[PDB]
Design a protein around this nucleic acid. Structure first.
Ligand SMILES: [Zn+2]
Lengths: 50, 107, 66, 148, 348, 146, 50, 148, 49, 148
RNA sequence: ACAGAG
């Protein structure tokens, strides 16, 4: 909710996107994971062909 | 401190010689090749830079008959110096002529 | 960060044309008219003003001042 | 402050990445009739086996857009066409396909083929040779295995 | 006593690229100190290491014993490893801009006067060839003008003096050989070298490049020793950029633009292929399709569509190569085999 | 040069010296110095009528003029120096066979644009005294050896 | 990273160097341009004799 | 006529659609049958002339009829890279506090042209870090920024 | 993702482990609309050659 | 004399397979006196040849008409009276391949001789009594002047 | 332990 002239008093860029944490000085990003959907009937083949 | 070093061919007496012009580039080499090739006693003349870190040119001159290849090199230097003298004189005359003929207009 | 002093390709002094370039864009010119009114003929000199971003005017806002 | 040298990796914004190989003076460059002698000579053997036509159009569009103060869009699946940038070069006196008459700079005599001038947006990459040169004669060794 | 001197000019040092597939991925060269901050070598050795100069790093190993020097110089030399151990084909040979430049030098159109012939031949006079007499050959044309055809200037590379005992002999096909000429072909594509004078035919990849046998450097390697095949590659890598960077060789968007001879053939061929594919779709969905043997009804359709869609590519790509002029840049780079092919021209 | 905010200060001390342009590019006396040959566009066949209007737009805007002799427009070359050789006479299919675009070899048109150090009549006068002063240096190294 | 693949069959050596490469055709086909900064470090024991 | 083609071969540089022909320089002795192209000083001093066609402050355009390419190119190269001028090579900094760095400020002050005539000064010797009356100049920039 | 450029407007009051900047950056001459949407040409990475 | 072969030739074709080059045509000629066909590459820039011309082709072992075989290096500059002062087009190459004719299974007399003028070729095919003196690795001057 | 580079 700040204006670009009020990012100047915080030493921050108006174009820095965000979405990252600050923990012990470094900037860390929790990445998007990709997982299969739960509660779904997967009909698949076995190693032996069944 | 020496800017000229003559390296002769292994089998010919002074009519095949590779001049090594230190602290030069294509500038003097091309004009000097152009003024040596206008001599009808020269069968071959052309330079090459050794390596682009090193400022050198290997100017090879091979004459036809028995004359040494110091004479077309020196005649090339003298004729190029005379060409540059006449170009300087004509250019200064034309600059003074333009400055004089514009000084008589709009006055 | 700031306007470079010379054009990179040929060597014409460009770095005094910037405050005149923005002043001729204050008076509602197109950029092709301002680059001709500043005297830039070749295109290598034209990309020095046409493609320049003025970061020092916005880096100096975060600079310390009394 | 680091100045580019033999060994610094530049890019091309089309995948034609490349290291520097030679830094020649302004006098040994080829030059146009207007006096423009290029910064970065690029080998034309990258293009047939890689089929980057987008660089060949970025060059032409940038050249036709610096002569009259536009930014020709290179938007995906659209953008400024070829037929609209060929007509902005002929209006300003250049050739309609970018190829320019070139007098060479070593001999002073013109080249046979025409050479293809225009501005391409080259970006400098972080892989510099001053932070990759490395040489060990003999020095500190590990403690468990007495080897470097 | 033992002095531990710096590495100086003439030391034997190994030279390695990190994925080491075959034994020519590590060879031993003779070091020569230069001031800039890279490793540098002639581009004829880009074929064994498979390096490409795009932010590529290579390793170095200096031997410390005299026996390790002598086992690196005789066994692992570059002049003793010009062929691969796999089948015996040369790998250190010409690469791009040494095949394109030597192809345009040996065409029949190029005619040099005395000044430019002396200038191109005078580039090779550096190294261990600074002491030789240059042996400018006699001119071809005498009466109306005095001209040197570029095949003589290229044949200076094979015999640069009157005291060199090299006599090379080669007689093979080119790339664009029409099949019926045998040294009188229309393409001028039948190589004849007799007593190290190039008599007929341009220089392709299959004569100067790293492809296979009938390489003239392989002829020098098998007939006149290791050193005479390795001196001629330095003369070629010296001579071909001097001609190529003062001829001019550029590419452009007008080198891949289709003319009027292609934009009418492409439309008709696409319409013919689309209508035949629509007819085969309609004949599969609503009745009889004459099924190919050994497949189902849908796998038959796939073979007919992959037949018809490969007719459009081939008859559209043989209609662009009939309207490209000579001195086109990808066409020149595909005829000499340096970089590219015909599929790339016909695809872009 | 720079640009300041209140409280920031610049003080320094420059030392100008003399150097050639081959060392560093801040010693180059000219913005750009170059040349071109002089064109001579020639008309192999007469171009009359409405084809002279599609000829005088395939060139620079001041080289080919169109004039009338009998109420009919015929085209002649007027000032071939101003041409930049865009080669637009080769897109025009009917007019490729009525011109011969060329360059006169022994006629150069220089262009020297000074950066403001000294006026460009003395720059060309200094540049010839250097090529006169390179041939003088190796004449005094043939007389010293021999 | 065991003994038999990490420290016995192949092991870290000295008198070595690693730098970015760049083309140069003015050398012969059996030459390599070593920089001055690497040539001052990599030494060779030259035994003194007559 | 064959003699017409021989004359066009040594006097004109034609521009075709696909490549520039007749690029080289041929008038040397032995390259032609009935002509004599050996060096003749009176013919060169008779055919040469210089026409100055435009001149004002900081510009000059003129002609050189009669000279060849290997001397006009020499003049161009001496103008670009072998005519000396005066430029900054040392910057001694007392209290730089701005946002422009010290190396970038030294670089930007390196490129500002100086109006001093370089025929009056001489080269600074190897070393000689002080500078004397003969072979250097000295400028002083001092700017303090306050409020209004 | 590796071109030298400018991080943001606070690139001078910032102390990072490693930071590469370019001296005179220039915005591109042929640009996608994505460049205008993510405001790339307000702080670019590259120079027109 | 030193003449190996001399006959008047009438041109019957210029380019059978299209114009492959810019400076070289492929003359397919045919004699009147003997029965000789003639493939010949000339330079049509310096010497234009039409479709119905008729020229006199002489092939000589030397250019000095007394029969002097003194040729270690050709001097282009010297003006001494030679055989070439009667002709308009002179080349210099080497005979490199004598070949039997496979168009007859028995009882033939047609022998082909191939001369290469450094890349410009010439098949001279006729009866074996006319081609006497063409040896392999011999060096011959072609001489050629058009007629009325 | 992760990201790069060839
Ligand atoms: Zn510029």
């Amino acid at each position: 909710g700040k204006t670009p002239a009020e990012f100047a008093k915080l030493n921050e860029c108006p174009l820095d996107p965000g979405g990252y944490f600050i923990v012990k000085g470094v900037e860390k990003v929790i990445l998007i994971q990709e997982q299969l959907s739960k509660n779904r009937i997967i009909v698949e083949a076995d190693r032996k062909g069944a | 401190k020496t800017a000229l070093e003559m390296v002769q061919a292994a089998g010919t007496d002074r009519h095949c010689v590779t001049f090594v012009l230190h602290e030069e580039d294509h500038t003097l080499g091309n004009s000097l090749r152009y003024m040596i090739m206008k001599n009808p006693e020269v069968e071959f003349c052309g330079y090459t830079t050794t390596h682009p870190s090193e400022s050198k040119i290997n100017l090879r001159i091979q004459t036809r008959g028995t004359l040494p290849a110091v004479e077309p090199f020196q005649r090339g230097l003298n004729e190029l110096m005379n060409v540059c003298q006449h170009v300087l004189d004509k250019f200064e005359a034309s600059i003074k002529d333009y400055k004089d003929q514009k000084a008589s207009r709009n006055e | 960060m700031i306007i470079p002093v010379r054009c990179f390709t040929c060597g014409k002094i460009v770095g005094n044309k910037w405050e005149a370039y923005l002043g001729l864009l204050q008076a509602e010119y197109t950029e092709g008219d301002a680059l001709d009114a500043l005297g830039l003929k070749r295109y290598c000199c034209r990309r020095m003003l046409l493609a320049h971003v003025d970061l020092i005017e916005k880096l100096l806002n975060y600079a310390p001042l009394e | 402050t680091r100045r580019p040298e033999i060994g610094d990796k530049f890019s091309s914004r089309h995948g034609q990445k490349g290291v520097c190989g030679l830094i020649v003076p302004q006098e040994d460059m080829p030059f146009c009739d207007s006096g423009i002698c290029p910064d970065i000579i690029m080998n034309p053997h990258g293009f047939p086996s890689r089929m980057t036509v987008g660089k060949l159009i970025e060059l032409l569009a940038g050249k036709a857009g610096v002569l009259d103060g536009r930014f020709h869009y290179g938007t995906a699946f659209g953008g400024s066409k070829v037929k609209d940038v060929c007509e902005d070069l002929v209006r300003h006196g250049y050739n309609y396909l970018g190829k320019d008459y070139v007098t060479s700079g070593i001999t002073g005599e013109p080249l046979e083929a025409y050479i293809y001038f225009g501005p391409v947006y080259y970006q400098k990459l972080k892989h510099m040779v001053l932070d990759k040169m490395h040489a060990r004669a003999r020095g500190p060794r590990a403690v468990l295995t007495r080897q470097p | 006593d033992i002095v531990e001197r710096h590495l100086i000019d003439g030391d034997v040092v190994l030279f390695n690229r990190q994925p080491s597939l075959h034994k020519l991925s590590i060879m031993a060269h003779l070091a020569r100190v230069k001031p800039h901050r890279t490793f540098r070598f002639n581009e004829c050795v880009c074929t064994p290491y498979n390096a490409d100069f795009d932010g590529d790093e290579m390793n170095l190993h200096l031997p410390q014993t005299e026996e390790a020097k002598a086992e690196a110089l005789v066994l692992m030399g570059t002049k003793a490893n010009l062929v691969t151990p796999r089948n015996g084909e040369p790998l250190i040979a010409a690469i791009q801009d040494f095949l394109t430049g030597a192809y345009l030098l040996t065409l029949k159109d190029t005619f040099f006067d005395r000044a430019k012939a002396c200038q191109i031949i005078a580039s090779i006079l550096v190294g261990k060839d600074e002491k030789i007499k240059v042996r400018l050959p006699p001119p071809t044309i005498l009466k109306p003008v005095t001209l040197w055809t570029g095949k003589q200037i290229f044949s200076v590379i094979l015999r640069p003096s009157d005291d060199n005992p090299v006599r090379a002999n080669l007689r093979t096909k080119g790339k664009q050989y029409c099949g019926k000429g045998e040294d009188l072909c229309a393409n001028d594509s039948y190589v004849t070298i007799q007593n190290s004078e190039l008599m007929s035919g341009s220089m392709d990849k299959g004569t100067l490049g790293s492809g296979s046998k009938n390489n003239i450097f392989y002829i020098l390697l098998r007939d006149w020793g290791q050193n005479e095949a390795a001196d001629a590659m330095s003369r070629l890598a010296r001579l071909a950029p001097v001609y190529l960077s003062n001829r001019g060789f550029s590419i452009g968007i007008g080198d891949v633009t289709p003319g009027q001879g292609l934009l009418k053939a492409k439309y008709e061929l696409l319409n013919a292929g689309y209508k035949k594919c629509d007819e085969y779709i309609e004949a599969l969905n609503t009745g009889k399709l004459q099924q190919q043997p050994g497949c189902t009804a849908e796998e038959t359709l796939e073979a007919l569509i992959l037949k018809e869609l490969s007719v459009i590519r081939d008859h559209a790509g043989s209609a662009c190569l009939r309207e490209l002029d000579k001195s086109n840049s990808p066409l020149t780079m595909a005829l000499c085999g340096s970089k590219g092919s015909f599929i790339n021209i016909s695809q872009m | 040069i720079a640009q300041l905010r209140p409280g920031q200060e610049i003080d320094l001390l420059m030392h100008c010296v003399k150097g050639i342009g081959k060392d560093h590019a801040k010693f180059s006396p000219v913005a750009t110095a170059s040349y071109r040959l002089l064109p001579d566009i020639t008309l192999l066949e007469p171009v009359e009528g409405e084809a002279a209007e599609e000829l005088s737009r395939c060139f620079s805007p001041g080289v080919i003029e169109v004039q009338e002799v009998q109420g009919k427009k015929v085209a002649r070359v007027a000032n071939p120096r101003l041409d930049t050789f865009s080669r637009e006479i080769f897109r025009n299919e009917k007019l490729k066979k009525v011109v011969r675009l060329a360059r006169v070899r022994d006629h150069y048109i220089f262009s020297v644009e000074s950066t403001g150090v000294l006026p460009p009549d003395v720059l060309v006068s200094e540049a010839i005294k250097v090529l006169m002063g390179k041939c003088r240096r190796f004449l005094d190294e043939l007389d010293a050896v021999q | 990273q065991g003994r038999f693949r990490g420290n016995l069959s192949g092991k870290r050596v000295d008198f070595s160097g690693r730098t970015v490469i760049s083309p140069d055709p003015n050398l012969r086909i059996d030459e390599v341009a070593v920089p001055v900064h690497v040539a001052k470090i990599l030494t060779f024991p030259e035994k003194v004799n007559k | 006529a064959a003699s017409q083609a021989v004359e066009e071969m040594r006097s004109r540089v034609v521009l075709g659609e696909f490549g520039v022909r007749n690029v080289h320089t041929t008038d040397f002795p032995g390259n032609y049958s009935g002509y004599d192209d050996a060096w003749d000083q009176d013919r060169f001093e008779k055919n040469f002339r210089v026409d100055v066609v435009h001149m004002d402050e900081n510009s000059l355009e003129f002609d050189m009829v009669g000279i060849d390419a290997a001397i006009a190119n020499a003049f161009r190269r001496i103008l670009l890279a072998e005519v000396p001028t005066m430029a900054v090579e040392k910057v001694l900094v007392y209290n730089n506090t701005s946002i422009v760095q010290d190396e970038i400020l030294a670089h930007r002050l390196g490129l500002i042209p100086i109006h001093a005539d370089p025929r009056l000064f001489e080269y600074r010797n190897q070393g000689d870090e002080e500078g004397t009356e003969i072979d250097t100049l000295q400028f002083r920039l001092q700017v303090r920024c306050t409020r209004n | 993702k590796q071109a030298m450029g400018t991080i943001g407007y606070n690139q001078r009051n910032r102390i990072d482990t490693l930071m590469y900047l370019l001296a005179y950056p220039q915005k591109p001459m042929v640009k996608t609309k994505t460049i205008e949407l993510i405001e790339f040409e307000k702080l670019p990475a590259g120079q027109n050659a | 004399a030193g003449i190996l072969f001399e006959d008047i030739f009438d041109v019957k074709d210029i380019d059978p397979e299209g114009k492959k080059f810019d400076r070289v045509s492929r003359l397919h000629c045919e004699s009147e006196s003997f029965k000789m066909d003639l493939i010949l590459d000339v330079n049509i820039q310096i010497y234009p040849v039409d479709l119905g011309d008729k020229f006199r082709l002489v092939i000589a072992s030397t250019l000095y008409e007394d029969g002097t075989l003194d040729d270690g290096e050709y001097n282009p500059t010297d003006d001494r009276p030679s055989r070439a002062d009667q002709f308009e087009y002179v080349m210099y190459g080497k005979v490199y391949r004598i070949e039997g004719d496979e168009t007859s299974t028995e009882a033939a007399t047609r022998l082909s001789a191939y001369v290469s003028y450094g890349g410009l070729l010439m098949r001279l095919q006729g009866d074996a009594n006319n081609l006497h003196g063409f040896e392999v690795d011999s060096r011959v001057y072609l001489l050629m002047k058009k007629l009325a």
